[PDB]
């Protein structure tokens, strides 16, 4: 049967600066009697990017790489350190041994980073008068730059909390501040949204002393 | 020389259709490495699918891809072919070419859907003393009702980076995506500055530029 690779943790946190160690069991040894060789390489893969060497035949870094990056290992044993975790390093990695067919990849871990309370700034917008020329209106709020991910952000529309009609996204943690940003928009049809005038969103985070309201009039 | 493995575009294709995605390989002699082909599920696992010999033109293909799969190459073009037919709701996903385990390319991305292709309606989101916090002001555009994923955004032609956010499409219950792209600047230079999204659904050939100002 095929090799299976199995990497551990599948998801680790870490502040700056911390050691990171991450792990890939092979079910088989991929050490070639023949070449002495491990036939493991490591990949990073960058939010929205496609996979990049780290590490090849276990333990040679890629030129270009960062000396941080550490691999070691033999047999059915492989580690990937990161001596000090920066900032960047923000990714999922994973293993892949080439030592039979077929190829055969470990699940990932992605690597998060920890850092310290930011607060989020907190922006609304109006639907666009396009927009509702077209018979509806989108009311945008936006938390930028905040961490951690945990925020509460509350609809009120002429002081009526709203349930049901809003949808939240977040990004991809920064490549350089660590922080999330995140936008919740509230949906509703024309006339809907021409019935009521004043339109809020209310945001709680622990990086808030108390919650924050941001409104316009219609 | 830098190796580069330019792939073909994102592609929308029905159940049953049939798709040929290209990897053009430069910057280095294409007979002198394999070209392997890989499978990115939408949920990150990988999947290995086999390999073509750039000198023969043989491929080999890993038990699962045995069927319905082709490799193939152009070779006065430098060029490796991955034809599927017979699509099924499974084949979406990104498939990757790669020189083995020392390159890969940037991936095609293909979603296979009964539904239509629709390309997005862009609205600004205009800043205001309610978009204001501190001396900074944030602006951005709607980007919304389209299918499939993905849309590429872009500020100023590329120019505006630095505090640009273009957030994780959500779906709506119509089965449509719709995202936003955010910025933030000084409020005190919104009348100076000005401020383009660049808007590029591929699948549907929809390009729009739209300025965004103080309302």
């Known amino acids: 049967l095929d090799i299976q690779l199995t990497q551990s943790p599948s998801s680790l946190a870490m502040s700056g600066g911390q050691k990171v160690t991450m792990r890939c069991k092979s079910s088989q040894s991929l050490l070639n009697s023949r070449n002495e060789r491990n036939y493991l390489a490591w990949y990073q893969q960058k939010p929205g990017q496609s996979p990049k060497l780290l590490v090849y035949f276990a333990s040679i870094r890629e030129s270009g790489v960062p000396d941080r990056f550490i691999g070691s290992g033999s047999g059915t044993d492989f580690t990937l350190t990161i001596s000090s975790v920066q900032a960047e390093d923000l990714a999922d990695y994973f293993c892949l041994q080439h030592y039979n067919t077929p190829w055969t990849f470990g699940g990932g871990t992605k690597l998060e980073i920890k850092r310290t309370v930011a607060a989020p700034s907190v922006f609304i917008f109006p639907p666009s008068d396009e927009q509702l020329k077209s018979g509806t209106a989108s009311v945008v709020c936006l938390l930028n730059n905040f961490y951690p991910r945990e925020a509460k952000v509350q609809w009120k529309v002429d002081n009526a909390l709203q349930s049901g009609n809003s949808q939240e996204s977040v990004t991809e943690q920064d490549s350089k501040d660590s922080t999330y940003s995140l936008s919740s928009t509230l949906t509703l049809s024309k006339a809907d949204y021409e019935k009521h005038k004043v339109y809020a969103c209310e945001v709680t985070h622990q990086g808030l002393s108390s919650p924050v309201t941001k409104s316009f009039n219609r | ?215």
């Open chain 2, 1 to 215: 020389l830098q190796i580069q493995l330019v792939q073909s575009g994102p592609e929308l294709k029905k159940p049953g259709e049939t798709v040929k995605i290209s990897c053009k390989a430069s910057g280095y002699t294409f007979t002198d490495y394999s070209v392997h082909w890989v499978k990115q599920v939408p949920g990150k696992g990988l999947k290995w699918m086999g390999w073509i010999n750039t000198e023969t033109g043989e491929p080999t293909y890993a038990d699962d891809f045995k069927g319905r799969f082709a490799f193939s190459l152009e070779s006065s073009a430098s060029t490796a072919y991955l034809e599927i037919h017979n699509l099924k709701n499974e084949d979406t996903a990104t498939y990757f070419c790669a020189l083995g385990w020392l390159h890969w390319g940037l991936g095609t991305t293909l979603t296979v859907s009964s539904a239509s292709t629709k390309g997005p309606s862009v609205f600004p989101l205009a800043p205001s003393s309610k978009s204001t916090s501190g001396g900074t002001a944030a602006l951005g555009c709607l980007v919304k009702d389209y299918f499939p994923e993905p849309v590429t955004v872009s500020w100023n032609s590329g120019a505006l980076t630095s505090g640009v956010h273009t957030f994780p499409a959500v779906l709506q219950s119509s089965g449509l995506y719709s995202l936003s792209s955010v910025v933030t600047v000084p409020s005190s230079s919104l009348g100076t500055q000005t401020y383009i999204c660049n808007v590029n659904h591929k699948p549907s050939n929809t390009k729009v530029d739209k300025r965004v100002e103080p309302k």
